[PDB]
Design a protein around this ligand. Structure first.
Ligand SMILES: [Cl-]
Lengths: 250, 231, 244, 243, 111, 240, 235, 241, 195
């Protein structure tokens, strides 16, 4: 009844490869396509709701998760690993930041904390790396809008736009052609839906697509009034109806 | 073969090879005999020397005034187990003002040996013990094996060539059980039993080790010229 | 038990080498080249980014050059995630020293500490070493301008000019050829960029590929300034030296 | 291959081969049985007389837990003793907190969860015993049998060890021929017979019968060993049935 | 407040002769103004031709004597049934007593 | 914690990890210790594969443990820092409790004990380092030179070398060092130390470091030019 | 790989048996017990002529009444000696007496099997523990890394041990004097040593009731070597 | 090939021990089914008592986790009971700490997160079980949530688990394709149980007696299992129409 | 320990420290040096509870000496005082605090300036031109307020210090048995043997 695995399960091979990180990236490659596009006045993150059964209620399975009121995350790879990372990411945003400074962390620092957790699974005793790549979109007052990718290694890079998982090579080429530095949020959502259609085989609608935005402050979604310093969450998950509306103008 | 690397691995036929290899260390160890009547219990031990310059390795250890054992196999493991018995005998005395039952002593040794067979890192004990004692239900003799199996017996022997002594006792069973109120005759039967397990060497004065416990006899060990009487 | 699956990261080969340290150095040899050049009036840190994509947001990006305190900076070669663990430890040691002695940490003391941490992972604990090589650029009032490097073994050494990462053999020959002791920061800037321009595995060296920094004692009134170069400023210095 | 070298490793089948190897140690052991009767349970065990030097009625195999539960097992005898020692701690801590003596289904899961826990890690070995146990609680009589995997079920009759097929066949007749039920004193006699019939698989060495029982009428719901005249009456009944 | 100590009274007396020694003690055990027992032995044979008494608080006295007797038993086990000399016994008792330096045995001991 | 037994016996009675630690010492740059009548000199090789080095700030091969004792080494550099730190701490702890600085033998014995502890502790590998510990005991004018090695054995030497090609320089010292009459002066002792390194080093004076230790905490490191004068005088006498 | 505390199919601990092989590679150490004292002698075996041979400490004091000689990986003995010394001094503190030589030996041997996955491997060194006490007189013990100890009238350990033990077999009798035992240790050392025996590559010691444990001066040993040569030339 | 013995990535990006834990799921050779009514959630499972010596009352793979939550397991019983005891403990702890009864979906998530840990941490093996949780949640209404050895979990309109799950799944898929609703439009749970049994009979192609089935029913504020006689009443009604 | 004075002049720091060691009824010693050399150009005098004083001083001495060997470099008086303060500030919230007050007199070889730090057992650090601990300051600060000038020579500092000691000998009740005086300057630490 002992944890005897106090030694690394990820080690350097003779060629200089960290095998388990590479294999974790292979697992991410098999995963469903997700993407992120940064506009001037917002960020959009999107992915396919790959339903394991038609009897399953795919609404319950949220691939796109709120981390803070102004930061959202989406993934490609192993869903369970993602779910526990979101739980730790949400908690670390409080313990290591909000409870100290009285405000939510900026996107880059929350990303750094997530990255740190993923790095530790890459060096600590008796654990495999996480088998996910995350795309974290967010906004903060001094950095503005931002989009980050986080790999199984713990490495993270900021993107203007990118895609991960199944059809990422094709999707990244598509985004390179369409992206410019003068995009409005609606233009980015339009491009996101176009890019995502290429990697999707079957049905393509608001029920089989999950899409969220980091945009303007939503005082309607706040739940309370009387505090002018709190203007409401910038993160908003688009409804099944809201997606279908934009698919008619596609 | 592939399933003998540690104590935590069953073989495909349901065997624990490390326990069986520990069992093998006992067979390599020097012979010792245990036997009892209704009044007394006797340990007789053939001690082994390294060469002619060396002393003869002590086989018999006292656990309490009314209990003790003889060892065959790894002597350091016998020391660990005997010390554990000494403590349990002592705990019974101090806390309950009660001499530890010999049957209960065997149960404690079994359970201590067992923990080493089921857990990783540890090894089985590499020693077999013959515990004699006189408690509130008379004379007793136990045989401990490091698998955990403890067995109450009239007589037995463990170690190299112990099957010779064990057959003799199996024949003599009805005679030596009746040797009541006569320690010297019970020791004689033990010395005659251990003689069946000898080849080439014979029982000399610093070779032989005898112990006895009984009705009005504390556990006492006899070595040297004290055992010359019985050669 | 568990023993079966243990790589045994902290053992000697028959030749007397630490397997994992050697393989971590092999890992680092594939990372983007980082160059440190120390002049009489400052230090230059130049480094090549690995992931050229047009969509990478370069102005908010930091994979190579990090700040440890106001006086000391590092250039990284290897796993970025591993380096950031060590960087945050180094940042803490510097502030612990400041809190204790009310003086800024001497460069060598900080370097030794990080190097001692790296060493620990090679001798005990059964964990893989950090796949990181640092170039430390710094200043203190004892030794003035200092360049060091540390590697996964925990060994550190001082330098006048040095490279880590990819093509260090080629890079170190080119530096050894054109370096001189009386050199100045503006000359070292030019040498650093010329060296990367020749040793790069890319077709051409551009601003979007580089991280660049200078530690000068050429601030207002004899203080020291750390300048991490912005993308536009790296683009200007590339035109100035005549590479683009 | 190599899936059988470490405990807690799923083979490609979905099996834990180390647990199946622990079952072989159980199958190698002596026969032990359990019979559920009207108001209680009866346990019995085959004790092989290796030699004449074994003291009769001394090397007791059946163990009591608390005052109301009997346990008997086949396989590695020390592993059984270890499991009973645990059971006693579980039964003690249950009584300490909840006052009432541990119910038999509750007690069964306490052993079950513990034995199952030894199939979760490579740092421990599975138990080399199938354990037949039971007794009388507030909801009446209960007989259980617990395997190396941690699997257990309630039984009308239970049997394990080398003579299990022989015993199981005999138990299956009793279940068919007594649907209204078997009395406690009947079950003691039948238990003796079944151990005697199951001794044909271990027929080389002669043996010693040991029986125990919990019964609401015959023992006030407490575990007791069958001794003296009642034991001899059962031995005579068993000796008559084989001839 | 709970007071862990008490006073069970009594008196003891050791006298060393030329080739003998005596240790005497009264057999009365008391608390306050009540007699607990008129015969409660206080001077004990500890084996190895040593006699001991720990007069004062009877619980600490019994505890100490019990521990010393046990110390004699373990001295035999650990040193090949060697006789514990009276000087060695004395030093062994010093360590028993000082072991509880910050929660003392409330007894005056004579051997 | 990580508890794995890395240093263990092999069928032929060898602890391979301890022997493979000696191979790391064999790879290390040469170090030599020669004791005169009223001095000890520690010579060290500096490999010339590394030019563009900053010799002001690079870790020097000889380290002061206290004001009266020095420690040079051959083997893994990172490992040597751990021994030097522990030794320096123990040197101050001895002053603090004994009111007297360590003897050279005591300091050696400690460092050797630390090295031994790592050969039979779980989860750790041996130090890939052999040391030469040199100095003078407090209020004593007899020179002291000791050697340690990964296994944890230590011993006293009139002169000794460790590291790469230490076989060759030990050969040299075995014929050139006389016990009945050691190097009487500092000059003679330094000269014999430089000469012995010149057998292996195969370059002028940048590759040789010399540290002279004298009684009563008088330690001084020679400069390039001072060493280069010895190199010049040796080869001019050799041309004959 | 395989467990450190694993049993072989013959019923022996692999690591203990392999540590015994390391002890065979060690330098020779000989002990001879008599009624006038116990003599301990060792081969020093300096690896080079520049090694100052008086710094080779293979014979060691545990208490005034207990000495110790070693053979094998002699670095491993330092913690064993430390434990012995502490045990000897601690027992004097608790009991106001000298500690029995057997009890001291037993205390040392308790460390031996404290290894697993406590220390990571057995000791690679055997000890000859010689002493005197009032109960059992002059005693010589051989303490192994198995945790076993045997008492001996005489014993050789190390590289020349089986050859030396055969020689000790013939030569030892119960009426040996101390002076005879000294020469006998020197005789058997000179036989099994590679290099020629002198006062600088071999050391003697003894333990007597009066004077306690004494390592012999090189001048004293040199006279005993000269006395030996003459008595061997004498017939 | 030690990448197949512990929970680490193979070169393909696969965890073979997780995949072999899924195979252990079908070792019992039992098929389960769960469907939702208006006011209820019904779970049925095959009951196979091969030995005549077994007490059939103790042979069960349905567990009452809390008053509101029920759980059926597809897999070996020791792992099933490991999971059952933990779920009970978690549900009780939840109520104590947060002051309301643990929701079905939240328990499913919690157990799924525990399962995830066994796939990432090497010393723990995955449990060889698929846990189907059922309740009538006070916020969400009738609920089916399923957890597996991968640590995956999802809500269901209806579900099936076992060797012949695909046949049962397609049978249910086809029914909901007709009705065009997420549930069995039926008032009484008794008729929802009758539906469940009927559609398992059709899918598996086997008839059932009272001792071949095992039924669990979740209503508002209690989950309970049906006795053999309660099931017999159900079987009589099915046969009579 | 009773009186410890410190005075920073132009080019040096002067520390005067009483010689008496009194335990209750009797004066056990009249030649006690209540100071430790931490480094060649840094001296720390101390006063406070018996035992704690020396234990603390020697503990600080060992740490500064360890730093000196490790870096082959002498810490500045400012750095040493900051180290000492932190140790006392850590101490005050311990199970059993060090009851020790100190003066740290040092010559900063970099800045070529004498420096005097006064630190109490709480970890209250202050740089001063002249300092004292305990009851000494009640008499001596008013003197030094009157007679002190920053540009004083070492001889003038010593004359000013005699006037402080004379005033303490006149008006204090305890016989502190005179003072041991030590000067810290660019050349290091030396003791004035006649005072
Ligand atoms: Cl959770």
């Amino acid at each position: 009844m002992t944890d005897r695995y106090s030694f690394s399960l990820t080690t350097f091979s003779p060629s200089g490869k960290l095998g388990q990180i590479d294999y974790a990236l292979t697992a991410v490659k098999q995963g469903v396509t997700s993407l992120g596009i940064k506009a001037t006045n917002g960020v959009v993150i999107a992915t396919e709701k790959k339903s394991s059964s038609p009897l399953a209620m795919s609404e319950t399975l949220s691939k796109v998760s709120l981390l803070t009121p102004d930061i959202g995350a989406v993934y490609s790879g192993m869903g369970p690993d993602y779910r526990v990372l979101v739980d730790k990411s949400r908690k670390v945003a409080h313990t290591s930041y909000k409870r100290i400074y009285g405000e939510y962390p900026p996107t880059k620092l929350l990303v750094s904390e997530v990255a740190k957790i993923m790095q530790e699974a890459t060096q600590s005793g008796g654990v495999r790396p996480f088998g996910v790549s995350l795309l974290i979109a967010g906004h903060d007052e001094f950095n503005g809008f931002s989009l980050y990718q986080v790999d199984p290694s713990g490495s993270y890079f900021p993107w203007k736009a990118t895609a991960i998982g199944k059809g990422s090579v094709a999707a990244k080429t598509f985004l390179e052609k369409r992206w410019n530095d003068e995009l409005e949020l609606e233009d980015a959502i339009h491009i996101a839906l176009l890019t995502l259609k290429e990697s999707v085989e079957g049905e393509f609608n608001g029920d089989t697509i999950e899409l969220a935005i980091i945009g303007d402050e939503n005082p309607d979604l706040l739940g309370y009034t009387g505090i002018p310093t709190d203007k409401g969450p910038r993160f908003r998950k688009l409804t099944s109806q809201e997606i279908n509306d934009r698919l008619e103008a596609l | 073969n592939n399933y003998d690397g540690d104590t935590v691995t069953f073989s495909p036929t349901g065997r624990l090879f490390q326990v069986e290899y520990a069992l093998e260390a006992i067979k390599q160890g020097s012979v010792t005999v245990g036997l009892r009547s209704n009044t007394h219990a006797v340990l007789v031990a053939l001690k082994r020397n390294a060469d002619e310059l060396s002393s003869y390795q002590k086989k018999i250890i006292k656990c309490d005034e009314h209990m003790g054992l003889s060892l065959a196999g790894l002597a350091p493991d016998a020391r660990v187990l005997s010390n554990y018995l000494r403590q349990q005998c002592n705990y019974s005395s101090l806390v309950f003002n009660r001499k530890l039952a010999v049957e209960r002593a065997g149960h404690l040794l079994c359970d201590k040996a067992q923990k080493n067979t089921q857990s990783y890192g540890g090894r089985p004990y590499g020693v077999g013990l013959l515990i004699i004692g006189y408690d509130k239900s008379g004379a007793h003799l136990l045989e401990f094996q490091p698998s955990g199996n403890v067995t109450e017996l009239y007589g037995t022997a463990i170690g190299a060539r112990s099957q010779g002594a064990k057959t003799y006792l199996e024949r003599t069973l009805d005679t030596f059980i009746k040797i009541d109120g006569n320690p010297d005759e019970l020791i004689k039967a033990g010395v005659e039993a251990i003689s069946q397990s000898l080849r080439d060497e014979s029982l000399t004065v610093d070779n032989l080790s005898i112990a006895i416990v009984g009705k009005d006899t504390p556990f006492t060990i006899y070595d040297g010229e004290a055992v010359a009487k019985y050669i | 038990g568990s023993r079966r699956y243990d790589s045994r990261t902290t053992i000697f080969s028959p030749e007397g080498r630490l397997y994992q340290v050697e393989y971590a150095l092999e890992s680092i040899s594939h990372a983007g080249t980082a160059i440190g050049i120390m002049a009489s009036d400052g230090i230059v840190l130049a480094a090549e980014r690995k992931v050229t994509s047009t969509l990478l947001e370069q102005d908010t990006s930091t994979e190579k050059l990090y700040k440890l305190n106001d006086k000391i900076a590092v250039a990284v070669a290897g796993l970025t995630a591993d380096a950031e663990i060590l960087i945050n430890t180094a940042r803490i040691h510097a502030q612990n020293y400041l809190k204790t002695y009310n003086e800024d940490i001497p460069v060598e003391i900080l370097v030794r500490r990080l190097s001692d941490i790296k060493q620990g992972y090679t001798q005990h604990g059964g964990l893989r070493p950090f796949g990181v090589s640092f170039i430390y650029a710094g200043y203190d009032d004892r030794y003035g301008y200092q360049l060091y490097t540390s590697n996964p073994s925990g060994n550190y050494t001082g330098w006048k000019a040095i490279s880590v990462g990819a093509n260090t053999s080629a890079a170190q020959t080119l530096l050894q050829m054109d370096y001189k002791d009386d050199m100045k920061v503006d000359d070292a800037i030019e040498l650093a960029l010329k060296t990367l321009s020749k040793t790069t595995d890319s077709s051409a060296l551009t601003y979007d590929r580089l991280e660049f920094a200078t530690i000068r004692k050429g601030a207002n009134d004899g203080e020291v300034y750390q300048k991490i170069f912005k993308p536009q400023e790296i683009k200007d210095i590339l035109v100035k030296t005549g590479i683009t | 291959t190599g899936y059988d070298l470490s405990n807690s490793v799923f083979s490609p089948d979905g099996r834990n081969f180390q647990v199946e190897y622990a079952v072989k140690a159980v199958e190698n052991g002596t026969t032990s049985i359990g019979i559920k009767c009207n108001d209680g349970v009866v346990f019995a065990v085959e004790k092989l007389i290796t030699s004449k030097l074994l003291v009769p009625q001394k090397n007791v195999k059946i163990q009591v837990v608390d005052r109301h539960i009997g346990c008997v097992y086949s396989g590695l005898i020390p592993d059984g003793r270890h499991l009973v020692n645990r059971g006693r701690e579980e039964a003690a801590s249950f009584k300490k907190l909840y006052k009432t003596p541990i119910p038999i289904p509750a007690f069964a899961d306490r052993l079950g969860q513990y034995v199952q826990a030894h199939t979760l890690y490579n740092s421990v070995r599975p138990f080399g015993v199938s354990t037949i146990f039971g007794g009388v609680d507030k909801n009446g009589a209960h007989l259980y049998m617990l395997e190396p995997s941690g699997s257990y079920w309630g039984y009308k009759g239970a049997a394990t060890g080398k003579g299990r097929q022989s015993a199981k066949a005999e138990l299956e007749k009793l279940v068919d021929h007594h649907p209204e039920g078997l009395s406690a004193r009947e079950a003691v006699k039948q238990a003796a017979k079944i151990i005697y019939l199951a001794h044909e698989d271990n027929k080389e060495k002669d043996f010693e019968l040991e029986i125990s029982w919990c019964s609401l009428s015959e023992t006030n719901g407490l575990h007791k060993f069958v001794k003296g005249d009642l034991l001899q009456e059962a031995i005579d009944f068993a000796q008559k049935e084989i001839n | 407040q709970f007071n862990p100590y008490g006073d069970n009274g009594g008196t003891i007396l050791g006298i060393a002769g030329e080739d003998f020694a005596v240790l005497a003690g009264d057999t009365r055990n008391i608390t306050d103004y009540s007699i607990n027992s008129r015969y409660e032995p206080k001077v004990f044979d500890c084996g190895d031709n040593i006699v001991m008494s720990a007069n004062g608080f009877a619980a600490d006295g019994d505890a100490l004597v019990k521990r010393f007797k046990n110390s004699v038993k373990w001295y035999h086990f650990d040193h090949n049934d060697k006789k514990l000399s009276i000087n060695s016994a004395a030093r062994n008792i010093q360590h028993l007593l000082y072991g509880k330096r910050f929660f003392p045995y409330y007894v005056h001991t004579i051997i | 914690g990580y508890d794995r037994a890395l240093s263990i016996f092999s069928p032929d009675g060898h602890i391979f990890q301890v022997e493979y630690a000696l191979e790391a010492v064999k790879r290390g740059t040469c170090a030599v210790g020669v004791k005169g009548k009223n001095c000890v000199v520690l010579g060290c090789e500096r490999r010339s594969t590394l030019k563009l080095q900053d010799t002001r700030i690079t870790p020097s091969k000889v380290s002061k443990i206290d004001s009266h004792v020095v420690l040079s080494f051959s083997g893994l550099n990172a490992d040597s820092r751990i021994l030097i730190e522990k030794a320096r701490v123990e040197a101050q702890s001895h002053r603090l409790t004994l009111e007297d600085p360590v003897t050279v033998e005591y300091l050696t014995r400690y460092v050797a004990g630390v090295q031994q502890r790592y050969t039979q502790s779980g989860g750790v590998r041996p130090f890939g380092v052999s040391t030469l510990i040199a100095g003078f005991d407090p209020r004593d004018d007899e020179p002291k030179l000791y050697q340690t090695e990964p296994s944890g054995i230590y011993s006293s030497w009139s002169a000794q070398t460790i590291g790469r090609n230490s076989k060759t320089v030990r050969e040299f010292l075995e014929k050139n060092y006389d016990r009945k009459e050691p190097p009487a002066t500092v000059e003679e002792c330094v000269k014999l130390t430089v000469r012995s390194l010149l057998e292996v080093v195969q370059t002028g004076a940048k590759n040789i470091e010399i540290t002279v230790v004298k009684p009563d905490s008088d330690i001084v490191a020679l400069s390039s030019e001072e060493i280069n004068q010895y190199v010049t005088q040796i080869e001019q006498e050799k041309q004959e | 790989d395989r467990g450190v505390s694993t049993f072989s199919p013959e019923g022996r601990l692999f690591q203990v048996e392999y540590s015994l092989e390391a002890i065979k590679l060690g330098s020779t150490a000989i002990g001879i017990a008599t009624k006038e004292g116990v003599v301990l002698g060792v081969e020093k075996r300096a690896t080079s002529p520049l090694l100052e041979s008086d710094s080779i400490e293979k014979i060691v004091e545990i208490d005034r009444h207990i000495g110790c000689a070693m053979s094998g990986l002699t670095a491993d003995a330092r913690s064993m000696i430390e434990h012995a010394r502490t045990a000897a001094v601690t027992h004097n503190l608790y009991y106001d007496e000298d500690i029995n030589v057997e009890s001291l030996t037993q205390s040392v041997c308790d460390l031996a099997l404290r290894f697993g996955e406590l220390m990571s491997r057995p000791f690679g060194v055997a000890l000859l523990i010689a002493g005197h006490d009032a109960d059992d007189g002059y005693q010589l013990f051989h303490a192994e890394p198995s945790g076993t100890f045997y008492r001996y009238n005489a014993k050789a350990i190390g590289s020349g041990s089986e050859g030396a033990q055969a020689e000790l077999l013939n030569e030892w009798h119960s009426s040996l004097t101390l002076k005879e035992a000294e020469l006998l240790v020197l005789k058997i050392l000179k036989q099994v040593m590679e290099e020629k025996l002198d006062e600088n590559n071999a050391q003697l010691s003894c333990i007597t009731k009066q004077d306690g444990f004494k390592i012999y001066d090189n001048e004293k040993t040199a006279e005993l070597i000269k006395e030996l040569k003459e008595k061997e030339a004498a017939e | 090939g030690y990448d197949r013995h512990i929970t680490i990535f193979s070169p393909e990006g696969r965890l073979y021990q997780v995949e072999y834990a899924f195979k252990a799921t079908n070792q019992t050779n039992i098929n389960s089914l769960a469907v939702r009514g208006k006011d209820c959630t019904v779970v049925i499972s095959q009951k196979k008592v091969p030995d005549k010596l077994l007490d059939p009352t103790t042979v069960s793979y349905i567990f009452c986790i809390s008053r509101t939550i029920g759980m059926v397991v597809n897999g070996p019983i020791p792992d099933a009971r490991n999971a059952a005891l933990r779920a009970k403990a978690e549900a009780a702890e939840f109520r104590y700490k947060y002051g309301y009864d643990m929701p079905c979906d939240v328990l499913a998530k919690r157990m799924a997160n525990l399962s995830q840990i066994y796939t990432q941490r090497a010393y723990m093996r995955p449990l060889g079980v698929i846990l189907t949780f059922v309740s009538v949640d006070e916020e969400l209404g009738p609920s089916i949530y399923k957890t597996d050895p991968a640590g995956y979990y999802v809500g269901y309109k209806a579900t099936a688990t076992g060797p012949k799950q695909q046949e049962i799944t397609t049978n249910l898929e086809n029914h909901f394709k007709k009705s065009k609703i997420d549930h069995i439009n039926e008032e009484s749970w008794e008729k929802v149980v009758e539906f469940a049994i009927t559609h398992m009979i059709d899918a598996l192609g086997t008839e059932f007696s009272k001792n071949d089935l095992e039924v669990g029913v979740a209503t508002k504020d209690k989950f309970f299992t049906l006795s053999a006689e309660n099931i017999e009443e159900r079987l009589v009604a099915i046969a009579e129409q | 320990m009773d009186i410890i004075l410190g005075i920073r002049v132009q080019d040096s720091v002067i520390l005067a420290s009483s010689k008496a060691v009194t335990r209750g009824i009797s004066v056990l010693k009249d030649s006690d040096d209540k100071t430790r050399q931490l480094s060649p150009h840094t001296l720390m005098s101390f006063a406070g509870e018996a035992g704690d004083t020396v234990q603390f001083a020697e503990y600080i001495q060992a740490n500064i000496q360890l730093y000196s060997i490790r870096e082959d470099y002498e810490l500045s008086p400012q750095a040493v005082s900051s180290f000492v303060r932190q140790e006392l500030a850590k101490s005050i919230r311990s199970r059993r605090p060090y009851q020790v007050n100190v003066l740290i007199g040092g010559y900063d070889k970099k800045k070529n300036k004498p420096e005097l730090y006064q630190i109490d057992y709480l970890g209250t650090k202050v740089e001063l031109p002249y300092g004292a601990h305990g009851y000494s300051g009640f008499y001596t600060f008013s003197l030094l307020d009157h007679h002190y000038r920053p540009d004083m020579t070492t001889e003038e500092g010593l004359d000013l210090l005699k006037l402080c000691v004379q005033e303490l000998e006149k008006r204090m009740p305890m016989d502190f048995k005179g003072v041991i005086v030590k000067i810290v300057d660019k050349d290091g630490i030396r003791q004035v043997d006649d005072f």
